[PDB]
Amino acid sequence: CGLVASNLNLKPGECLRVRGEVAPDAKSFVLNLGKDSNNLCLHFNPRFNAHGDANTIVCNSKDGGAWGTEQREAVFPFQPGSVAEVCITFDQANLTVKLPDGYEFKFPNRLNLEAINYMAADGDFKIKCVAFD
Amino acid sequence: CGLVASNLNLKPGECLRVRGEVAPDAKSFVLNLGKDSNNLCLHFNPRFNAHGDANTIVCNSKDGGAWGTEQREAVFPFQPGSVAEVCITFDQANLTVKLPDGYEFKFPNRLNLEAINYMAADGDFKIKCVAFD
Ligand SMILES: CCCO[C@@H]1O[C@H](CO)[C@@H](O[C@@H]2O[C@H](CO)[C@H](O)[C@H](OCc3c[nH]nn3)[C@H]2O)[C@H](O)[C@H]1NC(C)=O
Ligand SMILES: CCCO[C@@H]1O[C@H](CO)[C@@H](O[C@@H]2O[C@H](CO)[C@H](O)[C@H](OCc3c[nH]nn3)[C@H]2O)[C@H](O)[C@H]1NC(C)=O
């Protein structure tokens, strides 16, 4: 269990930037964003070698404790033993996740949050900097 | 009412850098550091005009919910409506607080903490970036 931040008050259009070091023997890491641990508009889970998955970004939501429908992306711009920056912004329709190597994707915003107030990091990613636009 | 962060895992000699925006009508702002909200090794409270103090930094500790004895600093390199960075490190004896314009002071590590896991901001200071060296 890594850094947990609350009262972020991240509003639509504002950018959250997270830079961290991926462990040389990294298996996976998680950034969770939402209201609290039971209410996540984005569970962002790069899997290097975890849950039978290799070099796959798994995303999901959590609403009132219930995991939503998982989605997977088709690009994996992470390397064990390197520094990586993730940048996230949202509006009512979508979260936009911007990753290294120019890659960006959208994940549907399935919750009804006015702001993103909670972020939790876990796994093989040492957070070095967080910036709130 | 500002950012709260836990599981910081800050160890002796490591640098925590906090950059924020001092509100234009600023009267007081607070950075709290410690084990948790009831065990603060550093309550850092620049007071522009608040609680009977003008342009004075008030520092204190909190041990098991009980405030310690206030210490007032000799310097005040803050201005309302500006950006400011504070940098904090600690060891067995002291917290060292580095301030804008080359000022710094020490505050005793009264709780003998060997890790700082909690930070919270309150008052007229909007955190924009937190970095770990
Ligand atoms: C045919 C059945 C396949 O079904 C599997 O079921 C697992 C358990 O439900 C899912 O794994 C789960 O996926 C979740 C988000 O969807 C979170 O990442 C959970 O960890 C959250 C966590 C724990 N610790 N830190 N973070 C993780 O255990 C796994 O992806 C899924 N696989 C597929 C291909 O669909
Ligand atoms: C006018 C003087 C009569 O004596 C005063 O008594 C106040 C209440 O005891 C002290 O003020 C208190 O000081 C504490 C740290 O010691 C914290 O800063 C408290 O804020 C907590 C807080 C709110 N939001 N964020 N943090 C703050 O209300 C104040 O220094 C003291 N002043 C002097 C000059 O002696």
Curated annotation (Swiss-Prot), chains A, B:
A beta-D-galactoside binds at H43, F44, N45, P46, R47, H51, N60, W67, G68, T69, E70. Keywords: Acetylation, Apoptosis, Cytoplasm, Extracellular matrix, Lectin, Phosphoprotein, Secreted. It is found in: Secreted, Extracellular space, Extracellular matrix; Cytoplasm; Secreted. Residues 2-133 form the Galectin domain. GO terms for biological process: apoptotic process; cell-cell adhesion; myoblast differentiation; negative regulation of T-helper 17 cell lineage commitment; plasma cell differentiation; positive regulation of apoptotic process; positive regulation of canonical NF-kappaB signal transduction; positive regulation of inflammatory response. GO terms for cellular component: collagen-containing extracellular matrix; cytoplasm; cytosol; endoplasmic reticulum lumen; extracellular exosome; extracellular region; extracellular space; galectin complex. The modification N6-acetyllysine is found at K11, K27, K106, K126. Its main location: secreted. The modification N6-succinyllysine is found at K106. Lectin that binds beta-galactoside and a wide array of complex carbohydrates. Plays a role in regulating apoptosis, cell proliferation and cell differentiation. Inhibits CD45 protein phosphatase activity and therefore the dephosphorylation of Lyn kinase. Strong inducer of T-cell apoptosis. Plays a negative role in Th17 cell differentiation via activation of the receptor CD69. This is Galectin-1. The lineage of its organism: Eukaryota, Metazoa, Chordata, Craniata, Vertebrata.
